[PDB]
Amino acid sequence: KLANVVILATGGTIAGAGASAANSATYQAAKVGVDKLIAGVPELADLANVRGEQVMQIASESITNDDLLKLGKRVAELADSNDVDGIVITHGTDTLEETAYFLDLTLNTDKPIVVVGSMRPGTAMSADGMLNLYNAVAVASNKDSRGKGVLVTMNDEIQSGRDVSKSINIKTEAFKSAWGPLGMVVEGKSYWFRLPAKRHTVNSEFDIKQISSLPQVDIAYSYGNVTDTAYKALAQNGAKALIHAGTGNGSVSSRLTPALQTLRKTGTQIIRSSHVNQGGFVLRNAEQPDDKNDWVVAHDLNPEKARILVELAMVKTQDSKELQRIFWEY
Amino acid sequence: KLANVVILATGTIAGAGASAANSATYQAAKVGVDKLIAGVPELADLANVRGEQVMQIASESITNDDLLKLGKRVAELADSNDVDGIVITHGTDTLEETAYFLDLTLNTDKPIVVVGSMRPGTAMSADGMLNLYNAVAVASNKDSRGKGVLVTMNDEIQSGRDVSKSINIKTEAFKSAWGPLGMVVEGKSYWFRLPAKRHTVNSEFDIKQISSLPQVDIAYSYGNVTDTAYKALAQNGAKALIHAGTGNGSVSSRLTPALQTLRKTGTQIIRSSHVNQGGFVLRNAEQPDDKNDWVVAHDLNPEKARILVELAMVKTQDSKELQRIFWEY
């Protein structure tokens, strides 16, 4: 009959609330509850059979690697149940883009996985959450959503969990992808215009089932006058890979290169990403000799997605050439 | 007559690839301001052109001293009766930081245009020749006076305030969240909008009174972040920290305590974000700015907020004033 969709709540704005309606700021993060939430969008009942669970109650900006492994596992066990057709995950928008890419890489299932958040507090005037949630259930419950990877359904759009990023603050169309949306959801109905071209879910070489721990990976920012300080400090603190958020085409200040070649020698992966995030990508051997130094380029991945790919890739290889290949297919 | 335009060369516009089909991989900043004016003889149809090699740097490696040196030379030129507009050729990586710096400290109404190129000169369909020709067309036009520092790339007139390097590889790399001020076509300028923020002649900042810039650093926020870069940068003498937060300059709760402490010990805390295509960080929204005595960088991305703060701190350390500054420039 209808599909069986499970909602995993993890906190959010969605189920947040401010002092009021005119107040689309200052709101408290992860304020309500899953059963409470489902109960407020009774239309859901027309799309599918929905069950909800509260996995964690967090603010996405304070998320942890463990919260990620915990959510990763939980979805795996649900994906295996003969009586779960699709999964919607409620999440804070700050780090939605990281979780989404995390799940796209390690969830070896065909079943639609949908992450949704909201830009305005639920009690805010014209709050976006209702409709986003309605549409997330709409997509998780359609047989055509099967096999397209992790999906994000905000603002009437179907975005790929791999490359959508929080790019516009305050506004409802905050989530954008440099490669565009895969489709649109209008009145709970799905319209597809494009398909993913990168490895994910069912065709991924990674399995959450095989991950017990995630390695420590950190990010340093490049700008005029930057020094090697933040990089050596994160390495000294445990960073197993450093994501270099360079200016331009992943460029490294001349005052830092030496730091980076030494860190490399002492076994730290060096991944060149950039703070030029609306389009294009970082090219290998263009601004730095990646072959000579044994560094890796993050391709089109922004600093935070690149972090997600590396922590996961490093769960299986410590070979620069292998990581390069991986940044090139996922 | 004809405007007297001066090109200040600082060192891709000056880069050469190994080939014609090498539209990357190149050595940037290898050619002379003189061979640059001479490669484009049509310049002479717009104005009286003279150039100077102020420095030869790779922009991803610029330092505060190179900024102060370019800012003083520009001021000296702008004061001259014999200079109508100025053009600065610069590498694109940090062109956005230099363009805003100049907009804040050059109290002059003469046009200052900063231009670069996405492809090296030796490349097929190299964008540089037109960029320069247009930078000179804009600098030479009386209409350009008084609009702040301008960036003329990809046929557009952008504000040096909020234009940013947003797209890699493409010739349309430079965008602004509030759009272009106009376009430049066949050496003619077309205007559609005017700047609303304080700049140049209306700036309370003056290069002539700046002898040094305070050290300001940027720390990035992401899932599982720690206070490690924050503490280290400060320990290394950062006088203010730009926090490149997630969402509306949000702060990881395992980091808040270190920020409170740094603040207490005198480091300015400026909340910015890595949500840069549009929107802004709102005071007291994700964090009690009033209570912790922090500042919000408004719509400015992290490298821009650092530029405004180094310069604001040359005159004040009052976080109330730094906040008014973030709201007007």
Add this chain to the structure above:
Amino acid sequence: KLANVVILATGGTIAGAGASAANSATYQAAKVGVDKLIAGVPELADLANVRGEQVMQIASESITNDDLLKLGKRVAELADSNDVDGIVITHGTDTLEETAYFLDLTLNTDKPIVVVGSMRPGTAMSADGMLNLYNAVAVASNKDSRGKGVLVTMNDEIQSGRDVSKSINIKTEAFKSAWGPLGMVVEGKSYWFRLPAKRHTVNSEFDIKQISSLPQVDIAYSYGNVTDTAYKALAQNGAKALIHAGTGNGSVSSRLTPALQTLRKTGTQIIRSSHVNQGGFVLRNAEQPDDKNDWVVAHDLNPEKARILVELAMVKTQDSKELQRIFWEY
């Protein structure tokens, strides 16, 4: 104390009610139309003293040139009153860009005129009209909105009435300008980032006070294999000016320049616009010899917006050279 804002409804209700906002005796006793609109969003009262008036009852895709005139004339009367500090006009989104433009050119006033609409029906889940109307009022009552021209406040933005256009179907962010937003409006507060550089309201040479009738102006679309049929039918049915929605930089098919030249001769003004509407503009003498044939280029103006500038310019002149000048200053 509070500014005085008048809301002029031109169609159906753009927003729904709320909590007690709807149950309240106030709401309940409120006479349908614009009175239930104001009563539903009680937070309005905290921005200004608001009053509504239903000036017309139209579907925006069916607006006529007499409807423009009437709204235009009523705005001028209101602006003139000492008792009116600002005006909000609720309007259908289909031709909102057309009215917004017309009011910018003919209302010689510095009091804020704000046009606002809604992409989702007042009854939909996550309906945007409520917050849009709350922000229109917030903008109409800020002394900082004065002398900025007609404003449109949708999707938390402050768009210029001149070049804002409905560019995306469905989405709440439908309205875009090639030159960007002027600012944003969040939690009732205004944030400005750009100023208009073109003529409008107070510096306009046109005045509704003085316009009694508008000239007939029509639009003809160009594409592969177009013929002169529609150009010739529109002129024969009374068009005084033809807006050519051309391909590229207002290019004209060689099979059509003949009809154009002859209509020109028999007095029809020929305005070369284009169907390339996300940016750039039409250059005089580039695709056609405008000088020789005595045609006008619509500069960056889309077809419907160029129709608006011409109906007006032609209230005052029929000189091709003057029209050109006006296309370049407004």
Add this chain to the structure above:
Amino acid sequence: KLANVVILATGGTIAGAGASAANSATYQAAKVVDKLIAGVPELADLANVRGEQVMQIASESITNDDLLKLGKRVAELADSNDVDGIVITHGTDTLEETAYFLDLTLNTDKPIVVVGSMRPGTAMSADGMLNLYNAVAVASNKDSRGKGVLVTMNDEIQSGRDVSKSINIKTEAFKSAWGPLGMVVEGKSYWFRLPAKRHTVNSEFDIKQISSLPQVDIAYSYGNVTDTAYKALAQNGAKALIHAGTGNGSVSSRLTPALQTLRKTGTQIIRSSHVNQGGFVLRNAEQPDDKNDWVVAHDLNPEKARILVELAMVKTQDSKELQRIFWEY
């Protein structure tokens, strides 16, 4: 084993030339094929290239007969053992219309790339050289087969189906609401997305069975519009009319009557819109299409909806089949 690429020239600015290097206007396009290939000598490291001049037209004046001729020539080469890929140089005004036509009726998986220039080859920083290089690099690659007709301008690989000339003047003129499929940098292709709609080898339409195309015309909608253009076009023989409505393909109530009646009389009524940067037109939203027996153009702009209808009309006159096609291609 170099791939074999055939370059078909049809005219337009890539082959253009003005009277000066400064001018990106007023120039004579479709002025110069051997000239084309000799000028980018590096093409030879990509593939074995041969060219032929098929027509020499100005794209804004193209006829349906020009489309069948081209479409027919492409099928003949696509069939030859000797052709691995095809590049077509075309003026940019109606390039989005020929790319889409070809996407629909060329039953082949061999790469078909349509390319143009925003600047004449005489201009400074002229875009055609690299564009051309890039077209041959994409047409030569194994990876391009089976993706539909592609457009390679501005370093992007755009889908021939929804790419549209959206920006005037600029080298970035060509955009799609659903984004680029990838990019080509240094003759190499990077793919980020795949087509989801029927095209080429999976289209039910075939240029070999098309010997003629139905007349299809477009009428524009705005405030105060009348039934005049609708009626004059139908009288003159349009078999389908594309309505470019305001909003969600909205119809003025003063026009509904001419439409219902034209429908009665046998013309197809396809509701498109002039809201072209995104979204689509919904069936039964603004008009009772079910009752009126009309069709909705989905996300297709006026000019694309016309290509699809004239083509669907070679197979069916059934409104419901037509609707289906509008939903799959």
